[PDB]
Design a binder for this molecule. Structure first.
Ligand SMILES: *[C@@H]1O[C@H](CO)[C@@H](O[C@@H]2O[C@H](CO)[C@@H](O)[C@H](O)[C@H]2NC(C)=O)[C@H](O)[C@H]1NC(C)=O
Ligand SMILES: *[C@@H]1O[C@H](CO)[C@@H](O[C@@H]2O[C@H](CO)[C@@H](O)[C@H](O)[C@H]2NC(C)=O)[C@H](O)[C@H]1NC(C)=O
Ligand SMILES: *[C@@H]1O[C@H](CO)[C@@H](O[C@@H]2O[C@H](CO)[C@@H](O)[C@H](O)[C@H]2NC(C)=O)[C@H](O)[C@H]1NC(C)=O
Ligand SMILES: CC(=O)N[C@H]1[C@H]([C@H](O)[C@H](O)CO)O[C@@](O)(C(=O)O)C[C@@H]1O
Ligand SMILES: CC(=O)N[C@H]1[C@H]([C@H](O)[C@H](O)CO)O[C@@](O)(C(=O)O)C[C@@H]1O
Ligand SMILES: *[C@@H]1O[C@H](CO)[C@@H](O)[C@H](O)[C@H]1NC(C)=O
Ligand SMILES: *[C@@H]1O[C@H](CO)[C@@H](O)[C@H](O)[C@H]1NC(C)=O
Ligand SMILES: *[C@@H]1O[C@H](CO)[C@@H](O)[C@H](O)[C@H]1NC(C)=O
Lengths: 322, 175, 175, 175, 322, 322
């Protein structure tokens, strides 16, 4: 006699799947919802290249740390890549004021341009040529940060500096300067003449007075003295006013800045790979369609949700028990 | 499972069928073979693909940057951020996992339901012109050529056209 | 769908019925009409209303104030807050959307199940006093006046009261 | 519920049955008694236990320390922490509550389905050799000794073996 | 022949609904779970009015910026509404110390009462009425903050000021004061005799000594001078001690404060609408029954969960297939 | 006639369960997913005891507040328990710099060992035994912090102190010191002699110069003077260099520290209970197997997710209709 039968598909699939009530259910077809794949590279973020600092910290890069790679015209970036512990930070040991907020500010920049603001050759009443250290060599000879000037007494006096720069540019600019904190009154007298000394800086926003701090300290890179750095954003058509009787680390170069967005500083040993994404990870970029991933927490961009699992498999086919 | 079909009254699936998920197996004078039910296979596929795409597309993803920007005298804020990150990972992990479990179960139950509804489609088509073997198979009380079986699959099976012949063989053997 | 009723053996719903969600359509000697099965309709209404009230009431809402209180040298903390806000938004959006999808499916399937349970209720009352047309409709083997039908609805139908009438009435038709 | 069995055509459960969750009650000339369907009961136990253990084990827990470490001039940051903590509390509360509700419904319906598939297995075994009383019980049109009911549970019930006798008592009771 | 048929409801409904497996499903009835409605008004939060400073910053309002409100007496409020950029902040240019934390403190107040703590008539050895400026105009005439006093030398002396106030009130009070930072020694001398000057402020908790920073600065409202403000909470039975030989911006009025809760500062251009809610938004209030909303992220009160969706529709009825 | 019946389990269970569509459904068996039980005790975290300060703050404990119980040094702890308002904080009134960051640092410690770095017997040119106060009473007699030394002029001179300590240990050490702020110049001269005074502290990282601040203040414990404390972490093979003109509160004892993890400070009135857990609460420890709990928000360890509910009951059995 003749017959018709209803039944269902079956195959060679070893693909398993879990269920609220059942485990290891072999199935016809399945799809992993968890993304686990990256390209192992650092890439542009949406067609905007990142700022890749090699052995330089942000400080060392902004200031002209001579042991750091020579400066590159890079007008635009989406995020900054630093290594975990850059070898070249401050050649002359010291500190950077409000450094993290500056790094955050600089994490993503729409326009950036190094600009000469006060020529080293215009400090006629002071020594602008001896402010040099073996800890900061340039071309084998002792030197110093390249965008900033360490002023010394000329002949045997340190006349009171009064100097100002007006931002005649059409963009905000980041201005950097510093104090030297010497070890003793002898060193103080030797470098400047003046024993009790100050540096005051004024802006439509800033009203600062820095006084160096003489103190006996441990040697760091053979030096016990310290350099302390400061910064501001000078508005267009605004001016900055420096006055100092000593210990002044004066500006020479500053930076035109345009900010339209924020990102962060990414810590990565990877290197650029001529690439574009919407999700960058320290281990590589992600071409992101999946709703979840398990690559790395510290991401920048439009990424899947980071999750702690090794597999998220959705059953699409049906039970397959051969 | 829930509807008792797939791993129930139908003990096992067909390696033979390849063109679809649910289907028919016929055997007559022209020979035997498999043929998948177009409609139910496509509907099941559309529903499942829609499920996966719903689970995927409802995710809101916006730009975020992270992120270790605090110094060694800002470790309380660092801890606060840690508690936030870890909290979100815990939420997304738990929800993703449970979503996959629950929805997988519903998917399997969906296949069960589909197969049962197919069996009821054929059952409701032939009625007493054939015998229910309880194996998921129907024993025809009459001659059914390829056009006739393709008309069972089509949902176009003509019951009156065979009512009497089947009637005869039924009152011959069904007692 | 899942129970093979609503978009299955019942090809279509009834504009005619107004009194409820699930019901009966009769046509006898006295005429035709619709009548909604109140009990099961009330059960469905209470269940769905309870579902919605659960989706609304389980929500814990407490006072929160937000919130842009950081200056331009606190933008790291500002970003921390941004990540927090956006994270919670993504969580709530995804969960709400998916909740709505899953529960919508469950609701439709709930109606399906209810209808099937009703058809099977009637099935269990009449048995061989009627033929299952497979239409969701029953073809009566005996006389059923309005008062006969309300007892199908009441669930008080006496099968013996017609068992013999149907008997004679059946093999007369069994040509 | 969804399958119309447990609190449906079967009004109530059996205090008498103890050996399992789903089972049978028989009464013949040898006497009456209960016997629980071992297999489906164990399937159900493994399934529900796996459900609960999955709801517990999928939880990711990591070390956290909380946490009131901000002073009276850092109250904005404390407020950020507060928004975070309360946010997580809200998420976890809503998700836990709704999860318990949904999975409870699913569990009850799982029981419903199991019982119903049991009932249908028997129904499809007996067919017209017995009457469906609509209470979940079957009245045999023939004598069924212990070994026979023992064959009803086995899924090996011989329908032809009794078809004639059952027919006899059916058309005999049929006026 | 007789017939019975089981079936289901259907209607004229056009309401669609989505499902995990099916889209655009027409349905008998549905209920939106997403709230989208606001009243476009600013309202009370649980029967407590907000503090609505119209064109004043919190600073301009606390200190008596003359262009600000004739003192908006509000003994009690639930939140503060500021505009995005209030025209009236500090009339005399400068800064407010720990300003944001102060605004947060003042965001929600149970009792607030302005009280005179040091009468202007008690500056017998100093001129207490010439501390007036064109940067702080009232009615075309030069003026100053109304709750704070710019003390200037009388004749040609600035004797050392010693003053103390004991909080005999039963409530904490917010005390405000300031320093003037001049541009040059000439301005310093003209305003205050003494060239080297200080201001010490003492409390059981506070131990402050401020020194002016004379420095050349850019002009703000035509001025290069700066005003820097400071504040504390003086506990009951505690005293506050000011000592100064110059540059003192002294308290006259202070504020009784009772705090029982916290909120935040809301930025809105709107106006009060004589109204009550439990959920306020910068765009308007929410009468909140739904569990989700898409109005605005920056809310205050017991609000629904903010969500990025245009509709959350729950099927209540059944399929309505035309 | 003979009969076969399908049915299901039933019993006397009164356990209810709620369902998305049904409430108070009596059921065969159920399992609560919500943890509600604690042991009412303070316990170890992973077999590591907490540091329990009973009536001393972290400051009072670190500096040797004589009113604090002198107890057996605890080289290791997993978290710290303070009371909400400890009776003994700073005996001599004043402040602690970066105090919360220090408490956070000390919240979880792998090794802690008190160490003498500058013996009291080595201040031969100053009085190291008169630096004593009634606000810091020991055995009914006036005293001072025990790990720190209040140096006063001897006879009528205060020679300039120059002191250094080189960390010859293999572990970082926490070093603490302070400044004294007198009420007037008369007291300044009386205690020290020199009128204008400083304290410089130098490290490979630290460059500090503190100047006392004279201000008239309210009396706290009968005193208007103030003590201000400071700290650092001294790396191995680094040295710390103090120079002082007067007002120096010098180190005597410092602390060897090893940190490998972080926790926090818990506020609890409870007591140790010779007990171990992985989840501690201020109200007691939790035996955590359940995924949710409702005990307390402020937890330390691997805890269930805190939730605001009285009940999370899962149905395992089936409907139980009487
Ligand atoms: C910085 O320099 C610019 C340009 O010299 C100044 O801008 C001018 O300001 C004068 C008043 O000094 C106005 O009369 C001009 O109309 C401005 N010129 C233009 C075209 O902008 C600016 O004022 C200076 N800023 C400071 C702080 O000195
Ligand atoms: C503020 O003024 C009150 C009243 O003079 C001072 O409190 C009194 O102080 C004396 C001496 O200590 C006691 O005899 C009174 O009983 C105190 N009264 C109250 C209510 O405290 C208080 O000391 C003053 N504030 C300061 C900083 O000393
Ligand atoms: C602290 O003392 C140590 C012990 O001498 C100093 O470290 C040594 O420095 C000398 C050179 O002067 C080396 O020859 C030794 O090998 C060093 N020992 C080690 C283990 O480093 C250290 O320089 C001193 N620290 C300071 C800052 O004075
Ligand atoms: C401006 C100046 O004086 N530079 C000199 C410094 C400093 O005196 C100290 O080293 C600072 O700490 O010392 C040198 O030996 C050096 O480092 O090369 C020589 C150098 O010319
Ligand atoms: C080192 C020292 O001089 N201690 C003395 C102090 C100081 O004069 C003040 O406390 C400084 O402000 O005053 C005492 O009355 C005290 O507090 O018991 C006596 C004590 O011998
Ligand atoms: C379930 O499947 C995974 C994948 O192979 C395997 O590691 C695990 O051991 C399996 N469990 C059992 C009991 O089969
Ligand atoms: C669903 O319906 C909308 C109208 O609300 C229509 O615009 C859209 O194309 C439909 N979506 C699809 C393609 O399923
Ligand atoms: C459910 O039971 C609890 C405890 O007896 C009771 O508080 C509540 O009123 C019940 N709910 C309903 C709807 O009866």
């Amino acid at each position: 006699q003749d017959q018709i039968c209803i039944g269902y598909h079956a195959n060679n699939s070893t693909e398993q799947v879990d269920t609220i009530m059942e485990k290891n259910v072999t199935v016809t077809h399945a799809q992993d919802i968890l993304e686990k794949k990256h390209n192992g590279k650092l890439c542009d973020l949406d067609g905007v290249k990142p700022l890749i600092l090699r052995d330089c910290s942000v400080a060392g890069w902004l200031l002209g740390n001579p042991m750091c790679d020579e400066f590159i015209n890079v007008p635009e970036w989406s995020y900054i890549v630093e290594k975990a512990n850059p070898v070249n930070d401050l050649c002359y040991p010291g500190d950077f004021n409000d450094y993290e907020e500056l790094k955050h500010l600089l994490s993503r920049i729409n326009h950036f341009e190094k600009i000469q603001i006060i020529p080293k050759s215009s400090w006629s009443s002071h020594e602008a040529s001896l402010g040099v250290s073996s800890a900061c060599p340039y071309q084998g000879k002792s030197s110093f940060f390249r965008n900033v000037v360490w002023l010394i007494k000329k002949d045997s006096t340190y006349p009171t500096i009064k100097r100002s720069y007006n931002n005649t540019n059409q963009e905000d600019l980041l201005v950097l300067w510093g104090i030297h904190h010497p070890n003793d009154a002898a060193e103080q007298t030797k470098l400047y003449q003046n024993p009790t000394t100050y540096i005051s800086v004024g802006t439509s926003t800033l009203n600062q007075r820095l006084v160096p701090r003489i103190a006996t300290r441990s040697k760091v890179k053979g030096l016990s003295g310290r350099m302390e750095f400061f910064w501001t954003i000078l508005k267009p058509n605004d001016a900055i006013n420096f006055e100092s009787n000593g210990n002044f680390i004066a500006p020479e170069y500053a930076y035109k800045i345009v900010k339209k967005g924020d990102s962060t500083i990414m810590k990565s040993e990877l290197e650029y790979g001529n690439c574009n994404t919407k999700c960058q990870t320290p281990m590589g970029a992600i071409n992101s369609s999946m709703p979840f991933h398990n690559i790395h927490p510290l991401t920048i961009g439009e990424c899947p949700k980071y999750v702690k699992s090794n597999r998220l498999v959705l059953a699409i086919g049906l039970r397959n028990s051969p | 499972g829930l509807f008792g079909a797939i791993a129930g009254f139908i003990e096992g699936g067909w390696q033979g069928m390849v063109d679809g998920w649910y289907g028919y197996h016929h055997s007559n004078e022209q020979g035997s073979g498999y043929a998948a039910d177009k409609e139910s296979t496509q509907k099941a596929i559309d529903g499942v693909t829609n499920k996966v795409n719903s689970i995927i597309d409802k995710m809101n993803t916006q730009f975020e940057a992270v992120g270790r920007e605090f110094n060694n005298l800002e470790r309380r804020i660092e801890n606060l951020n840690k508690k936030m990150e870890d909290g979100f990972l815990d939420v997304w992990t738990y929800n993703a996992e449970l979503l996959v479990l629950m929805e997988n179960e519903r998917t399997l139950d969906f296949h069960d339901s589909n197969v049962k509804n197919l069996y009821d489609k054929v059952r409701l088509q032939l009625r007493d012109n054939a015998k229910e073997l309880g194996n998921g198979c129907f024993e025809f009380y009459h001659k059914c050529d390829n056009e006739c079986m393709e008309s069972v699959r089509n949902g176009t099976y003509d019951y009156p056209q065979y009512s009497e012949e089947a009637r005869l063989k039924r009152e011959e053997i069904s007692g």
